Amino acid sequence: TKQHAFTREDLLRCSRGELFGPGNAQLPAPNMLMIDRIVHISDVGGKYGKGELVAELDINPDLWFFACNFEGDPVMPGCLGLDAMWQLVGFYLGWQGNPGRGRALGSGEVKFFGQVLPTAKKVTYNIHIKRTINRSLVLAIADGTVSVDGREIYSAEGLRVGLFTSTDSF
Amino acid sequence: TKQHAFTREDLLRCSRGELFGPGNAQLPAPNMLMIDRIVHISDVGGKYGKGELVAELDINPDLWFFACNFEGDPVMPGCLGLDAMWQLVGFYLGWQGNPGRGRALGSGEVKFFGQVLPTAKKVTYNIHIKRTINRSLVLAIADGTVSVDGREIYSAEGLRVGLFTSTDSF
Ligand SMILES: CCCCCCC[C@@H](O)CC(=O)SCCNC(C)=O
Ligand SMILES: CCCCCCC[C@@H](O)CC(=O)SCCNC(C)=O
């Protein structure tokens, strides 16, 4: 819980298993990695007073998903903005000092009410930690929002991610 | 509303705007496309009696997302399986004859309670259309499940996808 911001290089180190070590939380590597940086992470404050993260993804027209999603109608997939939020909540669990590899477990309501176009400059994620367990199973529940250049465009309530020292139950 | 099965080639045609026509519903192209084939699509039956789709994705170890998600611990992104269910619900709106381009609007509860490993053979999607509106807003509400080689692994309730003849709304 020592560092309160991470650079892209740190996130890529995490993707290689080199931030949290053997058997522990990894972020997806490119091209599934949906975060460039965590500008702030803490175990206090946020909407429930149980911690929060603020992170960013830089947008430019050349990001791979614009060319296929859709042809002649480029828009960032909503599911990748949602994955950034599961990615962040997983990271938080590792950052707190819990062992195990991440698996998203789901969410309550997800809403997409705006879009990221290839003319956008920056997407900002806000994550509010609602509750963590680490007696027994390791589990985080969180709410999140996605904003593009100042404008709220997605929300997710009850994001759930687990860390697992064995993933043969799945 | 007359063809009931669609091959990968038909789905790739759809990604180019050539199944439902220009300005109308498109699937994503690879690598965001998460369906190889629609085995069945109907506007009757299913859990609500208001329509259903059954669709498949073939799994092999060389699919692109396995290398990066995660490194040394391959597993299909839940977010892409979810997107497959949004992709299918959008397809159903296009298949019904409605004009306009697709956008996922969200879902109620998403649960991931098992995983697709690179040794799996085939992912099956089941979509049960719950409600469609085709006056004013064009909107579909659906439930879905994802299975892998017979085993149920994901669920989503209240998948929502809209068709938009203008997307500057978003
Ligand atoms: C640094 C820590 C990151 C852990 C969270 C990564 C974001 C998830 O969306 C990726 C999966 O969980 S893909 C597998 C989805 N779940 C199952 C049960 O297969
Ligand atoms: C024929 C299939 C097209 C309908 C839905 C395709 C699958 C969706 O996941 C893609 C988006 O909607 S990406 C944009 C998410 N929504 C907004 C408002 O940004």
Curated annotation (Swiss-Prot), chains A, B:
<dbReference type="GO" id="GO:0005737">
    <property type="term" value="C:cytoplasm"/>
</dbReference>
<keyword id="KW-0444">Lipid biosynthesis</keyword>
<keyword id="KW-0276">Fatty acid metabolism</keyword>
<dbReference type="InterPro" id="IPR010083">
    <property type="entry name" value="FabA"/>
</dbReference>
<keyword id="KW-0963">Cytoplasm</keyword>
<dbReference type="Pfam" id="PF07977">
    <property type="entry name" value="FabA"/>
</dbReference>
<keyword id="KW-0443">Lipid metabolism</keyword>
<comment type="subunit">
    <text>Homodimer.</text>
</comment>
<dbReference type="GO" id="GO:0019171">
    <property type="term" value="F:(3R)-hydroxyacyl-[acyl-carrier-protein] dehydratase activity"/>
</dbReference>
<dbReference type="GO" id="GO:0034017">
    <property type="term" value="F:trans-2-decenoyl-acyl-carrier-protein isomerase activity"/>
</dbReference>
<keyword id="KW-0413">Isomerase</keyword>
<comment type="similarity">
    <text>Belongs to the thioester dehydratase family. FabA subfamily.</text>
</comment>
<protein>
    <recommendedName>
        <fullName>3-hydroxydecanoyl-[acyl-carrier-protein] dehydratase</fullName>
        <ecNumber>4.2.1.59</ecNumber>
        <ecNumber>5.3.3.14</ecNumber>
    </recommendedName>
</protein>
<feature type="active site">
    <location>
        <position position="69"/>
    </location>
</feature>
<dbReference type="GO" id="GO:0006636">
    <property type="term" value="P:unsaturated fatty acid biosynthetic process"/>
</dbReference>
<dbReference type="InterPro" id="IPR029069">
    <property type="entry name" value="HotDog_dom_sf"/>
</dbReference>
<comment type="function">
    <text>Necessary for the introduction of cis unsaturation into fatty acids. Catalyzes the dehydration of (3R)-3-hydroxydecanoyl-ACP to E-(2)-decenoyl-ACP and then its isomerization to Z-(3)-decenoyl-ACP. Can catalyze the dehydratase reaction for beta-hydroxyacyl-ACPs with saturated chain lengths up to 16:0, being most active on intermediate chain length.</text>
</comment>
<comment type="pathway">
    <text>Lipid metabolism; fatty acid biosynthesis.</text>
</comment>
<keyword id="KW-0456">Lyase</keyword>
<keyword id="KW-0275">Fatty acid biosynthesis</keyword>
<dbReference type="InterPro" id="IPR013114">
    <property type="entry name" value="FabA_FabZ"/>
</dbReference>
